Amino acid sequence: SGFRKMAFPSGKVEGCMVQVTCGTTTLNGLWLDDVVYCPRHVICTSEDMLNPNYEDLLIRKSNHNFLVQAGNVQLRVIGHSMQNCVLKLKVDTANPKTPKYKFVRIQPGQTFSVLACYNGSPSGVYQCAMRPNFTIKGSFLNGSCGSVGFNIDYDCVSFCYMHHMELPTGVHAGTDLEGNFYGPFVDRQTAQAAGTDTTITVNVLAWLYAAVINGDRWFLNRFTTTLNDFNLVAMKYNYEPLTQDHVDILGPLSAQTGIAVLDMCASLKELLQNGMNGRTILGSALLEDEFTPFDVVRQCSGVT
Amino acid sequence: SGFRKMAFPSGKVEGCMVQVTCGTTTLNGLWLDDVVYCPRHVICTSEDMLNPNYEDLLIRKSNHNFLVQAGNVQLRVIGHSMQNCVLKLKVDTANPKTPKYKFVRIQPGQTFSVLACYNGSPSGVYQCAMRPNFTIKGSFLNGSCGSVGFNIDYDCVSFCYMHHMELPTGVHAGTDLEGNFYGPFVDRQTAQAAGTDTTITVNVLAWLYAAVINGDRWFLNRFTTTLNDFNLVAMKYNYEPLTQDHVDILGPLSAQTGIAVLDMCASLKELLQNGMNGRTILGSALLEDEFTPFDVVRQCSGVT
Ligand SMILES: O=C(Cc1cccc(Cl)c1)Nc1cn[nH]c1
Ligand SMILES: O=C(Cc1cccc(Cl)c1)Nc1cn[nH]c1
């Protein structure tokens, strides 16, 4: 009973957090095996984030300029390289707490947990999603750079995000663990506006299924729709277009509740057209889109 | 930038989760030093949760009937005792992963993180609050019993909650780590209705301060109120009465923003009287009450 915005247990990732200092800039690194991953802007001063030439700035840095501290003990840096917008710091010691891991690049609409860190130390964990405009709506102050986003499948941590930047609009931009930014963002102190933040339609439907499973059924109606009819309404409300792939992924939720995906689309169509009318669904007064269909099944079944 | 429902990093608590089996019932235990804490209903069959006499049921149980497994290794039970609604299982081995810890009994309005577990294994972490009716709005399926609620101050885990029961209304009831239930709930399969779920006024005000700090200011008005005037409105909307202790605790948030607590009370009074009018505050279309003033400061300052 109950449905919550739930993050993955963060222990496996906590054992990987380290502090990286270069010059006067300090941020977080991720220590997996004998490599520490961190944003390449650790080599910049605030006075040079305006137009950095990372390759030129890196020439003035040696292994001994990267101060890596895991807890209260210093790691010896024996190599360094830049891969896209991340630095890979080869250290002389393999992290004994390295979990089974993968580096994955996620698609918009996919959710992940963030272990927010400052000075290599974890402050909190929250669940968020890669927005359709490739931003994330996080909670990150200065110094949170290098904090990572991840998913867990039994004992394997799939790292998908590394935090780099806050846009002037208070939304967040970062890279996958290969250093490639999600979206068109660059690691520069220049105005970069985000595109339309559309709603993740398949996730809203998954969350409506979760609501039915937990007793919130007031929004269920006597109607049905088609993918093309639904999508006309989705376009009008800045919702992502629903495809047959999305319908397929909602299959298990549809099978569990006995509510056809297109009937749930009609319920969502009425919610968009009429609003909530002062009512709530799973404690929310707006349509939640940061639960994937997989998250709903996982939480509703008790996967560990 | 950004404000999220954030849980504490769960690693310290993950290292304490074990599985406890008695007969055919399996739930979670908390292993701290050489003692495993778990709900006493682990000794019950579903056929006897209707009217259990725990003292009589416990007479038929010996140390060897409590199967305690930490990961894939079995702990030897050398003693057992019942303290209120929890069982304390003395094991022959101190948990090497025991963090610095305390057992605290929280007041309504206070928030904590829950590490939801099944079969001694963590599934997720979420932030919730002790409701004014002494229930919690969690996410707990059968077998989640023994999952714990906690807070962390640097390296010390203060355990405040152990999950025991779901009420027929889908809300949750549990105990502190001394086995005393929060509220009037008993560990029996009998209908127990919760009281009025009032809104935690001081937490809503703290969250309104967090919204101002992060840029959401549309709700700020030209008005002020008094504690007695505000409380008349709070009574009408099932909000907890605001006291001078609550005003005092909001002092640092008032000092940071330059917004007098009573002026913020007037903003909240208008929000209650007029609603949101289709608008949102920190991504929410309702007034959030599960952030304490301490949570807002901690998150807004980056405490680790
Ligand atoms: O955004 C930054 C620094 C920065 C400026 C410009 C570009 C880059 Cl890569 C990084 N600080 C931040 C605090 N919280 N989240 C991010
Ligand atoms: O509530 C229970 C079992 C129970 C019944 C009656 C009393 C007691 Cl103590 C415990 N199952 C549950 C699943 N999720 N959360 C709780």
Select which of B145, B160, B164, B246 is catalytic. B145
The structure's method of determination equals X-ray
- Chain-centroid distance, C-alpha B194: 16
Tokens 């790292």 found at = A159
- Chain-centroid distance, C-alpha B115: 10
Neighbour tally for A297: CB within 10 Å: 17
Q: How far apart are CA A52 and CA A38, in angstroms?
A: 17
Residue B122 pairs in a beta bridge with B117
Breaks (C-N over 2.5 A) in chain A follow: none
Question: Nearest residue on chain A to B280, judged by CA atoms?
Answer: A286
Q: How far apart are CA A86 and CA A20, in angstroms?
A: 12
Select which of A16, A41, A160, A163 is catalytic. A41
DSSP H or E stretch at residue A102: strand A100-103
Tokens of A144: 């949170």
C-beta contacts of B270-275 below 8 A and 24+ residues apart: B270/B219, B270/B221, B270/B223, B271/B219, B272/B233, B272/B234, B272/B236, B272/B237, B272/B239, B273/B233, B275/A278
In degrees rounded to 5, what are phi and psi of residue A74?
-85, 135
Cβ contact A288:A271 at 8 Å: no
DSSP H or E stretch at residue A246: helix A244-249
Size of interface A-B (CB pairs under 8 A): 157
Q: How far apart are CA B206 and CA B210, in angstroms?
A: 6
- Chain-centroid distance, C-alpha A123: 17
∠ CA(A182), CA(A151), CA(A237), 5° rounding? 55
3-state secondary structure chain B: CCCCCCECCCHHHHCCEEEEEECCEEEEEEEECCEEEEEHHHHCCHHHCCCCCHHHHHHCCCHHHEEEEECCEEECEEEEEEECCEEEEEECCCCCCCCEEEECCCCCCCEEEEEEEECCEEEEEEEEECCCCCCECCCCCCCCCCCEEEEEECCEEEEEEEEEEECCCCCEEEECCCCCECCCCCCCCCCCCCCCCCECHHHHHHHHHHHHHCCCCCCCCCCCCCHHHHHHHHHHCCECCCCHHHHHHCHHHHHHHCCCHHHHHHHHHHHHHHCCCCCCECCECCCCCCCCHHHHHHHHHCCC
Is A1-14+100-197's fold the same as A198-301's? no
Judge residue A56's burial from the number of C-beta atoms within 10 Å of its C-beta, 0-12 exposed, 13-18 middle, 19 or more buried: exposed
C-beta contacts of B162-170 below 8 A and 24+ residues apart: B162/B30, B162/B37, B162/B38, B162/B39, B162/B86, B163/B39, B163/B114, B163/B138, B164/B39, B164/B41, B164/B85, B166/A1, B166/A2, B166/B140, B167/B135, B167/B192, B167/B193, B167/B194, B169/B193, B169/B194, B170/A1, B170/A2, B170/A214, B170/A215
Contact between chains at B10 and A9 (C-beta distance less than 8 A): yes
Tokens of B253: 């948030």
The DSSP secondary structure of A149-205, one letter per residue, reads EEEEETTEEEEEEEEEEE-TTS-EEEE-TTSPBSTT--SSSS--------B-HHHHH
Sign of the four-CA dihedral A41, A44, A47, A49 = negative
Cβ contact B10:A123 at 8 Å: no
- What lies within 8 Å, CB to CB, of B204 at 6+ separation is B239, B268, B287, B288, B289
DSSP H or E stretch at residue A14: helix A11-14
Residue bearing the CA closest to ligand 2, atom 14: B141
∠ CA(A230), CA(A235), CA(A236), 5° rounding? 100
Residues with CB under 6 A from ligand 2: B 41, 49, 140-142, 144-145, 164-166, 187-189
Q: Answer yes or no: B41 catalytic.
A: yes
Tokens of A273: 């057209």
Cβ contact B150:B113 at 8 Å: yes
Q: Give the alpha-carbon dihedral of A212, A218, A219, A224, to 10 degrees.
A: 80
In degrees rounded to 5, what are phi and psi of residue B89?
-105, 110
Tokens of A289: 């889109």
- What lies within 8 Å, CB to CB, of A132 at 6+ separation is A108, A109, A196, A197, A198, A200, A240
Q: Which ligand has the shortest distance to the CA of B117?
A: 2
Smallest Cβ distance to A170: which of B214, B301, B303? B214
* Closest-lying ligand 1 atom to the alpha carbon of residue A144: 14
Assigned CATH class of B198-301? mainly alpha
Yes or no: domain B1-14+100-197 corresponds to CATH 1.10.760.10: no
* Closest-lying ligand 2 atom to the alpha carbon of residue A1: 14
Tokens 């909000």 found at = B239
Q: How far apart are CA A86 and CA A39, in angstroms?
A: 5
DSSP H or E stretch at residue A244: helix A244-249
Q: How far apart are CA B124 and CA B122, in angstroms?
A: 6
For residue A74, the 8-state DSSP code is: E
Give Cα separations from B20 to B49, B113, B186 (angstroms).
Answer: 18, 22, 21
Q: Answer yes or no: B246 catalytic.
A: no
Residue A26 pairs in a beta bridge with A21
Give Cα separations from B186 to A209, B29, B182 (angstroms).
Answer: 32, 19, 10
Give Cα separations from B38 to B14, B66, B135, B142, B248 (angstroms).
Answer: 15, 11, 19, 15, 38
Strand order in the sheet with A73-75: A73-75, A66-70, A17-22, A25-32, A35-39, A86-91, A77-83
Q: Domain-by-domain residue ranges, chain A?
A: 1-14+100-197, 15-99, 198-301
| Radius of gyration, alpha carbons of chain B | 21
Smallest Cβ distance to A14: which of B2, B11, B139? B11
Strand B156-166, strand B100-103: pairing: parallel
Q: How far apart are CA B147 and CA B127, in angstroms?
A: 13
Yes or no: domain A15-99 corresponds to CATH 2.40.10.10: yes
Residue B117 pairs in a beta bridge with B122
Tokens of A12: 């496996």
Q: How far apart are CA A235 and CA A241, in angstroms?
A: 7
Tokens of A221: 């109606």
- The reported resolution of this PDB entry, expressed in Å, is 2.0
Q: How far apart are CA A147 and CA B9, in angstroms?
A: 13
For residue A134, the 8-state DSSP code is: S
Q: How far apart are CA A165 and CA A148, in angstroms?
A: 12
Select which of B41, B80, B163, B164 is catalytic. B41
Neighbour tally for B236: CB within 10 Å: 10
Q: Using DSSP, state whether A142 is helix, strand or coil.
A: coil
Q: How far apart are CA B218 and CA A286, in angstroms?
A: 18
First to last CA, chain A: 17
Q: How far apart are CA B130 and CA B224, in angstroms?
A: 30
